[PDB]
Short mmCIF file of N, CA and C and ligand atoms in Angstrom, two decimals:
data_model
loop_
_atom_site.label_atom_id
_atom_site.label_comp_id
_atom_site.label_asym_id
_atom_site.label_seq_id
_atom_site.Cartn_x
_atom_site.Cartn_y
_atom_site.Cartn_z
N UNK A 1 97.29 108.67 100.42
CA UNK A 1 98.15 109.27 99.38
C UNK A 1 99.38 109.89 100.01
N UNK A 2 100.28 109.25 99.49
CA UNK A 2 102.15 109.86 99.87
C UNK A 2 102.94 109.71 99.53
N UNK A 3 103.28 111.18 98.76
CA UNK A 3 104.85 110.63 98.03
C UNK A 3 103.75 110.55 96.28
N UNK A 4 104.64 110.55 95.44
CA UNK A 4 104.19 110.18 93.85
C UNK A 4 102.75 109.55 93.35
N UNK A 5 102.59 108.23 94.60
CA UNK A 5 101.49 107.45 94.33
C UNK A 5 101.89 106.86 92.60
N UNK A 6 102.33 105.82 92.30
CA UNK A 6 102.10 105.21 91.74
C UNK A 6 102.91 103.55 91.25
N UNK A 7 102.86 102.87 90.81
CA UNK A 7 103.55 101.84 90.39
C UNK A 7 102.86 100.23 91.30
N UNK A 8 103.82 99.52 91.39
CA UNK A 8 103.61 98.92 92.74
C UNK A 8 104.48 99.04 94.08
N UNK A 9 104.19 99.66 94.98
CA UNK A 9 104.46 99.88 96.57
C UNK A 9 104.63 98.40 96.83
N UNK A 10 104.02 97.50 96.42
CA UNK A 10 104.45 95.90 97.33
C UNK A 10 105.75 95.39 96.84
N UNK A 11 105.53 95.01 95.50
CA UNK A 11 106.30 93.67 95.04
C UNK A 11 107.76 94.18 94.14
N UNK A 12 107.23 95.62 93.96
CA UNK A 12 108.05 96.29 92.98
C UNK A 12 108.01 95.69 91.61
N UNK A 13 106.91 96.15 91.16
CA UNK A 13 106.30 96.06 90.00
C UNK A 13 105.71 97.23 89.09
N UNK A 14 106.56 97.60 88.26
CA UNK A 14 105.96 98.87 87.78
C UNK A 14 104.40 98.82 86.97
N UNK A 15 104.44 97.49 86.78
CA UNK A 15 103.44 97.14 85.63
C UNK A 15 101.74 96.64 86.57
N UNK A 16 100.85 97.91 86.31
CA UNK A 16 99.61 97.82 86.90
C UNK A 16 98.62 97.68 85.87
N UNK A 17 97.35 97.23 86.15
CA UNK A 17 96.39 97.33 85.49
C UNK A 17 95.02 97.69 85.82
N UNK A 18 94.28 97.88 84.91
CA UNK A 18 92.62 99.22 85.22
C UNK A 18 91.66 97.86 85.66
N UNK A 19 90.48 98.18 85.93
CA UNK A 19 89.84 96.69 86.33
C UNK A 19 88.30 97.52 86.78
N UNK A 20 87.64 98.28 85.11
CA UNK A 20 86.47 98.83 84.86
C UNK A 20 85.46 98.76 85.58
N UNK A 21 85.17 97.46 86.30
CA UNK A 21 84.49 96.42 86.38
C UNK A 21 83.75 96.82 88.35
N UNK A 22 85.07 97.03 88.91
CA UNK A 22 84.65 97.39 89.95
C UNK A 22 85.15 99.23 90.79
N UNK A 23 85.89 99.31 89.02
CA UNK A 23 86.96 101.05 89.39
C UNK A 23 87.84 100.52 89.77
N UNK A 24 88.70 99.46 89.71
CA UNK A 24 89.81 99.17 90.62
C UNK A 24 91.13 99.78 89.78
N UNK A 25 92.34 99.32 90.30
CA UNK A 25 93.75 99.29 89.73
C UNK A 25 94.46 98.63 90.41
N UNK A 26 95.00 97.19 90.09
CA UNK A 26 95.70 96.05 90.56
C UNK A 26 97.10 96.46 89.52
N UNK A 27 98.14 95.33 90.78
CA UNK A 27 99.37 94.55 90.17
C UNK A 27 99.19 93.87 89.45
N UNK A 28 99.85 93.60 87.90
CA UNK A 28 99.98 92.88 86.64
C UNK A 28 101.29 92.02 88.00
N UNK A 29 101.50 91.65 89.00
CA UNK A 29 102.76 90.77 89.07
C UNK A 29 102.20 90.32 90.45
N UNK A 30 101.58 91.01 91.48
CA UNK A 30 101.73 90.25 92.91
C UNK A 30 100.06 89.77 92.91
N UNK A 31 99.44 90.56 92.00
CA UNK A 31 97.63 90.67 92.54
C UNK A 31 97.43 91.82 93.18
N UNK A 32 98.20 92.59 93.59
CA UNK A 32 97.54 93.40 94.76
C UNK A 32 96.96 94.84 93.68
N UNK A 33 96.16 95.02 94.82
CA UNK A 33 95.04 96.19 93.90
C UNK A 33 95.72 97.37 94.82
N UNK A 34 95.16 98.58 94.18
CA UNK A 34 95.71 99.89 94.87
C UNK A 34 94.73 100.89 95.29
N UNK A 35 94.00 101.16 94.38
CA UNK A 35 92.76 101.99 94.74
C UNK A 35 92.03 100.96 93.86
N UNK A 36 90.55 100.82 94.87
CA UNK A 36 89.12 100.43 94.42
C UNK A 36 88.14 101.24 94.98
N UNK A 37 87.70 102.43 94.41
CA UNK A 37 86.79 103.28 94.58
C UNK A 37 87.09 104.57 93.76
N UNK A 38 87.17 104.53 92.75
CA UNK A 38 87.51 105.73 91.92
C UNK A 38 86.17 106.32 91.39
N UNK A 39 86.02 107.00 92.47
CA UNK A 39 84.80 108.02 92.74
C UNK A 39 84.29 108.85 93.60
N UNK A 40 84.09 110.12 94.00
CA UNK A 40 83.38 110.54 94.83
C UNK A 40 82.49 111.84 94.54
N UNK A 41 81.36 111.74 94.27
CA UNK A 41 80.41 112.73 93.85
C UNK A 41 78.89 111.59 94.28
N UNK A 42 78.16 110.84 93.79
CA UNK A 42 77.55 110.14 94.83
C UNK A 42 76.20 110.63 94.22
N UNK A 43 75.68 110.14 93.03
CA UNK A 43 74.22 110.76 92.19
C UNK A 43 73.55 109.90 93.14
N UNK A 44 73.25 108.67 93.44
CA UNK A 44 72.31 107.46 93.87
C UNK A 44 72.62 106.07 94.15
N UNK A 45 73.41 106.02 94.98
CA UNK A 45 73.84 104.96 95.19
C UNK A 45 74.06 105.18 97.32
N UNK A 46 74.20 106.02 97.48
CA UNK A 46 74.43 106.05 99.28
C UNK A 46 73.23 106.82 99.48
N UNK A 47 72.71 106.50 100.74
CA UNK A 47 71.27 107.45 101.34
C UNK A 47 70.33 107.31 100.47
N UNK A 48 69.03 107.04 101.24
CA UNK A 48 67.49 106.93 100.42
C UNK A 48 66.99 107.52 100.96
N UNK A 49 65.96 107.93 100.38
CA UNK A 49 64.65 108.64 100.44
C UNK A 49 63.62 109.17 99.62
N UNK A 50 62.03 108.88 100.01
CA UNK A 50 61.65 109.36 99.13
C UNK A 50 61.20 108.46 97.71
ZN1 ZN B 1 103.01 94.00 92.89
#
């Protein structure tokens, strides 16, 4: 994270889109994604036990 964070940084594309599916947020113009991991709190899914 630097600076505003948002739009597209590659292609110069203002136009992004949500992508539920895996948490992502991609370019509507080059493909490129920006953040895929929109999460961190962690109920059950990392570390087992028990
Ligand atoms: Zn782009």
């Amino acid at each position: 994270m630097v600076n505003k964070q948002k739009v597209c940084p590659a292609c110069e594309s203002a136009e992004l889109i949500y992508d539920p599916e895996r948490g992502e947020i991609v370019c509507a113009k080059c493909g490129y994604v920006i953040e895929e991991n929109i999460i961190d709190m962690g109920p059950e899914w990392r570390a087992f036990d028990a």
